[PDB]
């Protein structure tokens, strides 16, 4: 999924995905961190 998630690091990008819905592993975009499966 792609939501309005801050973008700073990858290690944190995951913690956000799991917290948001229930996913992890996701690259960071200049706009907002994208969540993946």
């Amino acid at each position: 999924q792609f939501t309005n998630v801050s973008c700073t690091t990858s290690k944190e990008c995951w913690s956000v995905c799991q917290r948001l819905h229930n996913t992890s592993r996701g690259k960071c975009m200049n706009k907002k961190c994208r969540c993946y499966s």
Binding site: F2, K27, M29, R34, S37
Partner: protein, 97 residues
């Protein structure tokens, strides 16, 4: 006479494998945990980058099929591009003056 034609034709291969792979993966990734494409208009773009050793990341293959296309398109894109890199070398030698 080969470095020229060989290079010119090589471009065709990458072009074919590009479309094919895209549609090939789409039909698969479409119904399975894959990148954010679920269509050719998006997949096709992914194949192009993958063929040019780009692979932005916004949309990467996951499923077997989807992933299989990436590798298939990669070899095709590189092969076509390679012939061009070598093609210039051959002609580059034929110009002492």
């Amino acid at each position: 006479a080969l470095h020229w034609r060989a290079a010119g034709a090589a471009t065709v291969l990458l072009v074919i494998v590009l479309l094919a792979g895209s549609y090939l993966a789409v039909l698969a990734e479409r119904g399975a945990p894959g990148a954010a494409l679920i269509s050719y208009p998006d997949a096709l773009w992914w194949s192009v980058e993958t063929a040019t050793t780009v692979g932005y990341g916004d949309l990467y293959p996951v499923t077997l099929w989807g992933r299989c296309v990436a590798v298939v398109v990669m070899v095709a894109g590189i092969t076509s591009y390679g012939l061009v890199f070598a093609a210039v070398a051959t002609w580059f030698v034929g110009r002492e003056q």
